[PDB]
């Protein structure tokens, strides 16, 4: 699919977790990797910034009706048989 480049920026997560021990002309094995891009020096696609943002979340709170606090409860004699 080659959408693999496009999840995280290619140079990103700057602190490297390893160290390649072998310097070779990697271009000759371009088909070992799932993505490959060789630049000469300072491509323009290195400096690209674009993001999405979540600008808030809004909930609600229910109100709790008490039957005895109402007015209608006048006409009744509320007892409670167990």
């Amino acid at each position: 699919s080659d959408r693999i480049a496009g999840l995280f920026n290619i140079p990103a997560g700057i602190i490297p977790t390893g160290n390649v021990l072998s310097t070779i002309e990697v271009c000759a094995h371009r088909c070992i990797f799932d993505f490959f891009k060789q630049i000469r020096s300072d491509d323009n696609s290195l400096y690209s910034a674009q993001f999405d943002i979540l600008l808030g979340t809004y909930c609600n709170t229910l109100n709790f009706v008490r039957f005895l606090e109402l007015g209608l409860s006048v006409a009744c004699i509320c007892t409670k048989f167990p």
């Binding site: 995280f8 990103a12 910034a49 674009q50 993001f51 999405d52 943002i53």
Partner: peptide, 9 residues
């Protein structure tokens, strides 16, 4: 998260 991934809160 705005420069490694493309999202922020």
């Amino acid at each position: 998260t705005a420069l490694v991934m493309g999202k922020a809160v």
